[PDB]
Amino acid sequence: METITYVFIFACIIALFFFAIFFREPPRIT
Amino acid sequence: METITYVFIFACIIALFFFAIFFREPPRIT
Amino acid sequence: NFMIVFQAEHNILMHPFHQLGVAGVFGGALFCAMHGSLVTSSLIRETTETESANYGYKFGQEEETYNIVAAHGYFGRLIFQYASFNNSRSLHFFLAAWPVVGVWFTALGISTMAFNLNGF
Amino acid sequence: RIPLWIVATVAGMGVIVIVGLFFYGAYA
Amino acid sequence: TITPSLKGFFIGLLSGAVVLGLTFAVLIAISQIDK
Amino acid sequence: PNPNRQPVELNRTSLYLGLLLILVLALLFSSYFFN
Amino acid sequence: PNPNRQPVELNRTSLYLGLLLILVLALLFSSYFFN
Amino acid sequence: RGWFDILDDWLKRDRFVFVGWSGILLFPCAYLALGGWLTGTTFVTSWYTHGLASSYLEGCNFLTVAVSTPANSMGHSLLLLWGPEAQGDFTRWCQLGGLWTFIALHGAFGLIGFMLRQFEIARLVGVRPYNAIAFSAPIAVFVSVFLIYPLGQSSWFFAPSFGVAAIFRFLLFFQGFHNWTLNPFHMMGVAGVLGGALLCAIHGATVENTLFQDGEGASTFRAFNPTQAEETYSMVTANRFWSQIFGIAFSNKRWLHFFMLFVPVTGLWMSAIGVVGLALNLRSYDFISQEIRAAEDPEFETFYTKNLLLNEGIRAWMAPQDQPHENFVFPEEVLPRGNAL
Amino acid sequence: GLPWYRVHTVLINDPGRLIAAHLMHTALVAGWAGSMALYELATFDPSDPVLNPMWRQGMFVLPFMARLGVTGSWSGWSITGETGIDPGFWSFEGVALAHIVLSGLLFLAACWHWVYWDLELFRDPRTGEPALDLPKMFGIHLFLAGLLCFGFGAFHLTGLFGPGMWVSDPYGLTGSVQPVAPEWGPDGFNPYNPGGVVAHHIAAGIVGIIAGLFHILVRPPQRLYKALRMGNIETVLSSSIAAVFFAAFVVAGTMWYGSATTPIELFGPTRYQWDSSYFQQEINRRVQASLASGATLEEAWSAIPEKLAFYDYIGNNPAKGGLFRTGPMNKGDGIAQAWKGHAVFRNKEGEELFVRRMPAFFESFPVILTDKNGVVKADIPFRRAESKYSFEQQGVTVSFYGGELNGQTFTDPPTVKSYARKAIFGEIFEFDTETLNSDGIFRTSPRGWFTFAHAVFALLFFFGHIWHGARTLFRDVFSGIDPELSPEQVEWGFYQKVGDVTTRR
Amino acid sequence: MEVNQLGLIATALFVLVPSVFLIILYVQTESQQ
Amino acid sequence: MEVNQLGLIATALFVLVPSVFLIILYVQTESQQ
Amino acid sequence: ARRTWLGDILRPLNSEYGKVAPGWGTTPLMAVFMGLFLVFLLIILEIYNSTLILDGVNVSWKAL
Amino acid sequence: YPIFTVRWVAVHTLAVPTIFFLGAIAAMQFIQR
Amino acid sequence: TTGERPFSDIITSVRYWVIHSITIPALFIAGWLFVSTGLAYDVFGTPRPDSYYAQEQRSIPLVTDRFEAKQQVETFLEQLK
Numbered sequence A, B: 001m002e003t004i005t006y007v008f009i010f011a012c013i014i015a016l017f018f019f020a021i022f023f024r025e026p027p028r029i030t
Numbered sequence C: 001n002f003m004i005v006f007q008a009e010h011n012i013l014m015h016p017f018h019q020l021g022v023a024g025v026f027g028g029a030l031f032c033a034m035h036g037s038l039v040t041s042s043l044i045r046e047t048t049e050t051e052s053a054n055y056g057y058k059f060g061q062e063e064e065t066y067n068i069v070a071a072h073g074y075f076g077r078l079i080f081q082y083a084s085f086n087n088s089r090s091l092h093f094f095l096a097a098w099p100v101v102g103v104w105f106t107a108l109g110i111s112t113m114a115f116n117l118n119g120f
Numbered sequence D: 001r002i003p004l005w006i007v008a009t010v011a012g013m014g015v016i017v018i019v020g021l022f023f024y025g026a027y028a
Numbered sequence E: 001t002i003t004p005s006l007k008g009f010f011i012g013l014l015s016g017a018v019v020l021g022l023t024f025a026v027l028i029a030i031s032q033i034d035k
Numbered sequence F, G: 001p002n003p004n005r006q007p008v009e010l011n012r013t014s015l016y017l018g019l020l021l022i023l024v025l026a027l028l029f030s031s032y033f034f035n
Numbered sequence H: 001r002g003w004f005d006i007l008d009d010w011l012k013r014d015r016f017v018f019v020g021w022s023g024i025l026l027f028p029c030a031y032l033a034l035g036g037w038l039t040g041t042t043f044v045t046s047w048y049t050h051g052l053a054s055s056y057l058e059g060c061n062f063l064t065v066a067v068s069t070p071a072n073s074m075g076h077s078l079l080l081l082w083g084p085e086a087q088g089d090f091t092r093w094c095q096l097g098g099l100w101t102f103i104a105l106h107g108a109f110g111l112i113g114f115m116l117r118q119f120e121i122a123r124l125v126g127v128r129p130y131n132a133i134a135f136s137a138p139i140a141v142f143v144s145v146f147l148i149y150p151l152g153q154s155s156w157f158f159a160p161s162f163g164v165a166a167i168f169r170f171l172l173f174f175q176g177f178h179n180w181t182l183n184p185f186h187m188m189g190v191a192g193v194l195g196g197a198l199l200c201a202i203h204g205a206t207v208e209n210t211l212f213q214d215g216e217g218a219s220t221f222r223a224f225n226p227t228q229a230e231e232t233y234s235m236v237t238a239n240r241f242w243s244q245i246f247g248i249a250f251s252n253k254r255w256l257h258f259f260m261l262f263v264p265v266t267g268l269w270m271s272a273i274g275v276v277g278l279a280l281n282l283r284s285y286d287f288i289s290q291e292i293r294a295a296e297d298p299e300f301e302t303f304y305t306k307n308l309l310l311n312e313g314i315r316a317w318m319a320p321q322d323q324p325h326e327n328f329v330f331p332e333e334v335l336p337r338g339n340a341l
Numbered sequence I: 001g002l003p004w005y006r007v008h009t010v011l012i013n014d015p016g017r018l019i020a021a022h023l024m025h026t027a028l029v030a031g032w033a034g035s036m037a038l039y040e041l042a043t044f045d046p047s048d049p050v051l052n053p054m055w056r057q058g059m060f061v062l063p064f065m066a067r068l069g070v071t072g073s074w075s076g077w078s079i080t081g082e083t084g085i086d087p088g089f090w091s092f093e094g095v096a097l098a099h100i101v102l103s104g105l106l107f108l109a110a111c112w113h114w115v116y117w118d119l120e121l122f123r124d125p126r127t128g129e130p131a132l133d134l135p136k137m138f139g140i141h142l143f144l145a146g147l148l149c150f151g152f153g154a155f156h157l158t159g160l161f162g163p164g165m166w167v168s169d170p171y172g173l174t175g176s177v178q179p180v181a182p183e184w185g186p187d188g189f190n191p192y193n194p195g196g197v198v199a200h201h202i203a204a205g206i207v208g209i210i211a212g213l214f215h216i217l218v219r220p221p222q223r224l225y226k227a228l229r230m231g232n233i234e235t236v237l238s239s240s241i242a243a244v245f246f247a248a249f250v251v252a253g254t255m256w257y258g259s260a261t262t263p264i265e266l267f268g269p270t271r272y273q274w275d276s277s278y279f280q281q282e283i284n285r286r287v288q289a290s291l292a293s294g295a296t297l298e299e300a301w302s303a304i305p306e307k308l309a310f311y312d313y314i315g316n317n318p319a320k321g322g323l324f325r326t327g328p329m330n331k332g333d334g335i336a337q338a339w340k341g342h343a344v345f346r347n348k349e350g351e352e353l354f355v356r357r358m359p360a361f362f363e364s365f366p367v368i369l370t371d372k373n374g375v376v377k378a379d380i381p382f383r384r385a386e387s388k389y390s391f392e393q394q395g396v397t398v399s400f401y402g403g404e405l406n407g408q409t410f411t412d413p414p415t416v417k418s419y420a421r422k423a424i425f426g427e428i429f430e431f432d433t434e435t436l437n438s439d440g441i442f443r444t445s446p447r448g449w450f451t452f453a454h455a456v457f458a459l460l461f462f463f464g465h466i467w468h469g470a471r472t473l474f475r476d477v478f479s480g481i482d483p484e485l486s487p488e489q490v491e492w493g494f495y496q497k498v499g500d501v502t503t504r505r
Numbered sequence J, K: 001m002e003v004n005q006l007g008l009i010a011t012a013l014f015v016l017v018p019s020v021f022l023i024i025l026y027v028q029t030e031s032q033q
Numbered sequence L: 001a002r003r004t005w006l007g008d009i010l011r012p013l014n015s016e017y018g019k020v021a022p023g024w025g026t027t028p029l030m031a032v033f034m035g036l037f038l039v040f041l042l043i044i045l046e047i048y049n050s051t052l053i054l055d056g057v058n059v060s061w062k063a064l
Numbered sequence M: 001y002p003i004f005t006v007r008w009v010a011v012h013t014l015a016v017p018t019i020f021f022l023g024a025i026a027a028m029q030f031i032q033r
Numbered sequence N: 001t002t003g004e005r006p007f008s009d010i011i012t013s014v015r016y017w018v019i020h021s022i023t024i025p026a027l028f029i030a031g032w033l034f035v036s037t038g039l040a041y042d043v044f045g046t047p048r049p050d051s052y053y054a055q056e057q058r059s060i061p062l063v064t065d066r067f068e069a070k071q072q073v074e075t076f077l078e079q080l081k
């Protein structure tokens, strides 16, 4: 379950990378 | 740890009883 | 453990007071589900499809929230017209009376088997 | 016509004697 | 070949078809007579 | 904008009922989870 | 009514940053928690 | 207008007993299930399948008559009258337990027909079909217990026999062999049934004791008009009473009646799930930690270990007669006794 | 606002986001398949396919991959027991990797369809409303399903273009993936005939192609369109849930009773093979055939394969587990190491005694030794009960033929009693219980777990079918019945026909 | 007692994941007006 | 490996309790207008 | 609504919403096929159930 | 008022075998045992 | 209501009594003769009080084979005969 935990946390981090890049709140001028 | 789990769930149930009685959404007429 | 030893010593399953109690609890569950389903079935349209139907009722409103005539028509067509309560007060008295009398009889059964008057 | 209470009493007595017959057969 | 169980299956199928046909024929006849 | 989006609600009574359901189910099934 | 109550806000950027902090801290400290 | 339309108008005509399209399935199947049960409990023995007398003709009473299950060597055979076991002979069909499968199959299709009747009447009357939704729970119980449970087991033999004392035997069998009381799905079933009985009693008493005075008589039943638009009882007073007595109270009547729907239906569905588990012998028979502790400690005694000993007694003392096909010969020294524990 | 249990109802009139949600579900399911295969590969021990096969190890998705032809791994092992070997790309790891990659691609497609929901294809050309022509959708999908079924039968299962499927001997000794020719006779409807599976897929695929063409070309009747509410996607959900619970009950039944698609080398034995003494009859038949040929008891019992003796053991019976006894079958009695041989019990006259075997119903069973007629000659008494058939008073000895203790004989009563207590389970095996901390309490096989999950799911989906059929047939009244509902419409003796205003008297 | 270790995490997640879900919904209901 | 078993629940709680907290706040921020 | 190349290709397959065959259409043929399907399901059920025993069809593992 | 109604059919299919069975059960009560 | 004659008017009718004072005794007599003449034992295969056990044996006649159960029952009935 140790390896499962490490891989799960890493996969959550990669999914968070995806959502932070492609589903960010867009910066709006003014 | 199994005894702690049972006592914890029971204590959560009693706390939920307290909040459901004294901090309920008040029924309003009409 | 209490149940199993009681069955061993008194044969409670063959005692008609326990059978009346089982009829009381089974009928109470049946009539609870039946009354709930018939009232829920005949709720008057007061909400949209997105809104929950429970918001159709206001606490303390004077008008009835469901059509008892439609529910009676459904239940009369389900069995026959005279097996259906047209009186809501009679129906709710029956709902109170059936499991209460059944549980009275099963409690008295436990007491009478306490004095060793056992089942058949 | 026959009064309804007469019919009800006759049916009740008939059902009572059929129950008594079944219980007599049970005890026998 | 036709086993005894296959003949029994044919008897059961024919009996079910006869029961359904009799039921629906009687219902259609009474429905036509009434209205 | 998608016009099919709708707001989601859960009142305090539903919160209390759901918490009671979850906690009672956990109290019932915890002995079997530990076994 | 209490006049000191104020709304609480967390934007999506703060959500992403907090999730990154929590997940990276968990990835760092999980080996030591398992030991 | 077409034979289908004329037949449809005839079937849904207002009369004393509604027929409908569902009646074609319901009335034959329900009538045959009831008539088969009465015929079996009146005339038909269980001598060749169980070694039991189970009819009025043999001398049994109302509590002890049953239409018993077929013999274990039948397996899960449909046991049709024209099938390879009975071969068209009605007498051998009755002797082999074919009446049990007759009643079970016709009762299953009758339950289907009754639920379709609920749907049909809800459609014509114009109400929501929540009565059919609620009736899904007795159907789930019947399918799990009388069909799925024997199908998972060795034969139809271990299904309940259609009788009072036979059902009591089924209860004791599940206690002794499955430890069915220890199963949490049965526990949720018990909670659903007892909570439904409680809800029935409490709602009826609450309505009857919060009635508005709408008539001059001391018998309040005549003070209700079915076509009245106003509530016959005070929901505000009932809510106040139960809030001050119990702490919480219903404040939404629609939620109250949905809850009355929800509790016993969910309980019965949970018990059906547990019965499916028992169909594969996936029982909640034991707690492994307590088994290990009892193995390593002779002085450890709880009510659960006593229940395990009682289950062992049930199994060993009832198995030779309840399962005559296995030819269990248990000598007196292998029978568990409390004076040897 | 929307209640929680209705949130997904925002998808009902949004075909693009419905496709996105379906793609997300498909990605989740494919990712589960890949990750489950990888977890099973990480935990699988391929060293002993005879006494520690995959169904003793709690392998759930490995038997399905093995069923359709995937027998090897990139590490070089095979489930049939071979080392070396070349599985090509389509090993267990290759299948798992393909599923993970598929999950990622479906996730990306779901993102695209969620963002670009407003496609002109989903809108009705003459009204501009979101509309799906459900009958022609059914025709297209049925044609595709028929094509795929026909291809699976004619190419994969046949072995024309594909690996074939797992077939085995009746006693699960020499199973392998083989090409299977279709069986077009009545024996194609034998569920234990794999040629029937091939013939089914060919014929049903052709029928599905024909029916898909029919449903593409011809429109539904107006009567059926109104009655089944074919403009409503919830009627598709209701009938689909109905067909799905039908198929779930079918697969649960065929898993529990056994078929050509549920071989015992991949899922373990059935409970009915223990009930009918199937493997015990085969073992006795082989032993008697060896004895009549002129061998002794030691040689006759030493010719029995260990796998066949392992099938004749109640710890491999799927009806012996528990609901909350988790993990593999090895977590129970242990990992089987070697057959101890056949135990023959004799009294002080040297007359053969037979141990009564435990039925699947019994959590515990007494030890009773009878002669060939069936009368009891010896037993083990319940705890401290007094006796007259005990092993000491009648001198019970046990002799082992074949296996590890071939030629040995034990006479000391505790050893003989322990061997009899093990002999109530059938064939006696040596178990390693320390590697997994085995507790000695039986677990069920993946056959039982599959049957349980799918029967429970089928029952719950019966409820789902009921609920959704009620919702689609009663769509006009599910926010409540008509506030102006006429009392004459629901009272008796006002209309001739129920619910028909035109039949007013 | 020799309990299943995963029972702990099972029970914890069985408490945590649905309850949190409800809490999320409840809190976002209170912030709407 | 012979790890501390509680590490699992520790890690899970270390993931779950703060992140859930943030999620709660975020969702109730999105429902305000 | 956004127009796409695949959308323009697939447009004829989603253009007949609500069009019906008048009256009863092919419903009797559908009923015949449903009855035949019911008979087929009964046949395979009683073969599996061993209620229907056919020559050359042994419903057992030993048929292989 | 018609006689051969659906109500007549239901009443008599439950009524005729009821009396046949009741006579059978009484004759059972006079079995010597 | 519904066009059927009320149950009270039916059961209080003299004509109903004069039809049902003949048919009901006829059915009761039919059932009594069904049991008393012993036709029920033959029709339903229920053993008579002297037909549970064979004269020599005291073994309960369970059927043990699926496809020979009919012949097994017939064999038991011949051995009691």
Ligand code: CLA
Pocket: E010, E011, E012, E013, E014, E015, E016, E017, E019, E020, H024, H025, H026, H028, H029, H032, H078, H079, H080, H081, H082, H098, H101, H102, H103, H105, H106, H109, L035, L036, L038, L039, L042
């Ligand atoms: C609502 C009506 C209804 C329904 C659904 C059933 C259902 C059933 N009955 Mg039943 N029954 C009914 C009314 C009904 N019955 C009535 C009114 C009677 C009194 C006569 C009986 C008397 C009865 C007996 C005595 C027995 C059953 C049995 C059965 C079961 C199996 C029957 C079977 O395999 O038939 C299969 C046949 C069909 C489903 C008919 C399908 C017809 C198709 C669609 C048409 C095509 C056929 C074709 C034209 C014929 C050509 C044949 C040729 C090739 C040889 C099944 C649960 C058996 C049972 O319960 O065993 C335990 C049994 O022994 N029934």
Ligand code: CLA
Pocket: I026, I027, I029, I030, I032, I033, I034, I036, I037, I061, I062, I064, I065, I068, I070, I095, I102, I142, I145, I146, I149, I204, I205, I207, I208, I209, I247
């Ligand atoms: C290119 C596509 C593809 C291929 C070749 C495979 C191949 C495989 N998958 Mg897989 N899978 C795929 C896509 C694919 N997958 C997708 C998209 C998903 C997500 C939904 C999955 C989810 C998935 C899971 C969850 C699992 C697999 C598993 C497997 C393996 C065993 C397959 C098996 O037993 O099927 C069984 C398939 C059936 C029994 C099909 C039933 C079809 C029904 C009967 C149709 C009924 C409706 C129909 C339209 C009726 C009309 C018919 C008409 C002709 C008359 C095999 C290696 C298993 C495995 O071992 O995992 C490692 C497993 O557990 N797959």
Ligand code: CLA
Pocket: F025, H266, I039, I040, I043, I057, I058, I059, I060, I323, I324, I325, I326, I327, I328, I445, I446, I449, I450, I453, I454
């Ligand atoms: C069809 C589903 C299915 C089936 C049959 C199996 C079967 C199996 N899995 Mg598996 N698995 C599945 C899905 C499935 N899996 C999924 C989806 C996952 C991802 C989470 C896994 C992850 C997984 C792992 C990680 C492992 C297995 C293992 C196993 C094996 C042992 C089974 C066991 O311990 O059961 C235990 C089953 C139970 C304790 C029953 C749970 C019953 C629940 C708790 C009841 C819930 C009641 C509910 C709350 C009531 C609500 C009431 C409300 C409505 C009012 C077995 C072969 C093990 C193995 O041996 O692999 C080698 C193993 O280590 N599986």
Ligand code: CLA
Pocket: I004, I005, I006, I007, I008, I009, I237, I241, I460, I461, I462, I463, I464, I465, I467, I471
């Ligand atoms: C193919 C299967 C399928 C599909 C597509 C749907 C789709 C739908 N159902 Mg439905 N349903 C199904 C099967 C299905 N159902 C079954 C089998 C049942 C019986 C249990 C039900 C019972 C049911 C009811 C009683 C209701 C719906 C409702 C709905 C609608 C809204 C659902 C929603 O927002 O849930 C939101 C759900 C959640 C936010 C949480 C659910 C979490 C569950 C309880 C436990 C966790 C499950 C787990 C994550 C998934 C495991 C997968 C499993 C298959 C192994 C939607 C159209 C509702 C409706 O009609 O609204 C108008 C409604 O009231 N369904």
Ligand SMILES: CCCCCCCCCCCCCCCC(=O)OC[C@H](COP(=O)(O)OC[C@@H](O)CO)OC(=O)CCCCCCCCCCCCCCC
Pocket: B010, B013, B016, B017, B020, B021, B024, C054, F011, F013, F014, F016, F017, F020, F024, H244, H245, H246, H247, H248, H249, H250, H251, H252, H253, H255, H256, H259
């Ligand atoms: C001296 C007074 C003594 C007070 C004793 C304390 C009693 C506490 C009663 C339960 C409080 C918690 C209710 C939460 C839920 C809550 O606050 O509900 C309040 C809710 C109010 O309903 P409304 O009609 O206002 O809600 C309408 C809509 O908002 C629906 O969402 O009442 C119910 O739904 C009643 C049915 C559930 C009744 C559940 C009672 C079960 C209690 C025992 C079960 C657990 C035992 C576990 C043992 C370890």
Ligand SMILES: CCCCCCCCCCCCCCCC(=O)OC[C@H](COP(=O)(O)OC[C@@H](O)CO)OC(=O)CCCCCCCCCCCCCCC
Pocket: C078, C079, C080, C081, C082, C083, C084, C085, C086, H016, H017, M010, M011, N001, N002, N003, N004, N005, N006, N007, N008, N009
């Ligand atoms: C609203 C009045 C009653 C309120 C209390 C009701 C509590 C529940 C009691 C129920 C039992 C007693 C009924 C009331 C009794 C009552 O009010 O007495 C009076 C009533 C008859 O009164 P009428 O003469 O006005 O009824 C005849 C009508 O057709 C009017 O022409 O009796 C019956 O309905 C007879 C019952 C036996 C009928 C047997 C028919 C069997 C045929 C098959 C039925 C199948 C249906 C199920 C299909 C799946």
Ligand SMILES: CC1=C(/C=C/C(C)=C/C=C/C(C)=C/C=C/C=C(C)/C=C/C=C(C)/C=C/C2=C(C)CCCC2(C)C)C(C)(C)CCC1
Pocket: D015, D019, H031, H032, H034, H035, H036, H038, H039, M013, M014, M017, M018, M021, M022
């Ligand atoms: C199986 C079968 C069948 C069927 C048949 C039938 C359908 C029959 C019917 C039958 C019937 C239909 C019968 C009836 C019976 C009845 C009786 C036997 C009654 C009794 C009663 C009593 C005893 C009473 C009681 C009471 C009550 C409940 C309440 C009050 C009190 C008293 C106690 C008085 C056929 C041939 C088709 C086919 C083959 C098989």
Ligand SMILES: CC1=C(/C=C/C(C)=C/C=C/C(C)=C/C=C/C=C(C)/C=C/C=C(C)/C=C/C2=C(C)CCCC2(C)C)C(C)(C)CCC1
Pocket: I028, I029, I030, I031, I032, I035, I100, I101, I102, I103, I104, I105, I107, I108
């Ligand atoms: C993006 C991308 C990618 C990646 C992907 C991945 C990495 C995936 C993964 C995936 C995964 C890895 C998934 C998973 C899933 C899972 C799931 C979905 C599960 C579920 C579960 C469940 C549902 C359960 C349930 C339960 C339990 C809890 C217990 C009790 C019983 C039951 C069974 C109910 C790549 C690079 C390739 C490429 C492209 C893109």
Ligand SMILES: CCCCCCCCCCCCO[C@@H]1O[C@H](CO)[C@@H](O[C@H]2O[C@H](CO)[C@@H](O)[C@H](O)[C@H]2O)[C@H](O)[C@H]1O
Pocket: F006, F007, F008, F009, J016, J017, J018, J020, J021, J024, J028, J032, J033, K020, K027, K030, K031, K032, K033
């Ligand atoms: C470990 C378990 C974790 C469980 C995770 C559970 C996920 C739950 C997701 C929350 C769903 C609610 O999502 C949130 O919904 C509300 C309405 O309800 C939306 O809010 C919308 O309606 C409100 C009410 O009119 C408006 O004030 C707001 O401007 C608008 O956006 C939010 O924009 C959306 O973010």
Ligand SMILES: CCCCCCCCCCCCO[C@@H]1O[C@H](CO)[C@@H](O[C@H]2O[C@H](CO)[C@@H](O)[C@H](O)[C@H]2O)[C@H](O)[C@H]1O
Pocket: G006, G007, G008, G009, J016, J020, J027, J030, J031, J032, J033, K017, K020, K021, K024, K025, K028, K032, K033
């Ligand atoms: C296992 C770990 C569990 C972790 C649990 C963490 C608890 C988190 C609690 C969050 C508290 C937020 O509490 C919520 O705040 C919002 C503002 O932010 C309040 O909302 C208030 O402001 C908004 C914005 O003007 C108004 O629309 C709303 O009418 C008003 O009440 C809610 O009334 C309150 O319920």
Ligand SMILES: [Fe+2]
Pocket: C035, C039, C092, H203, H207, H257
């Ligand atoms: Fe009410």
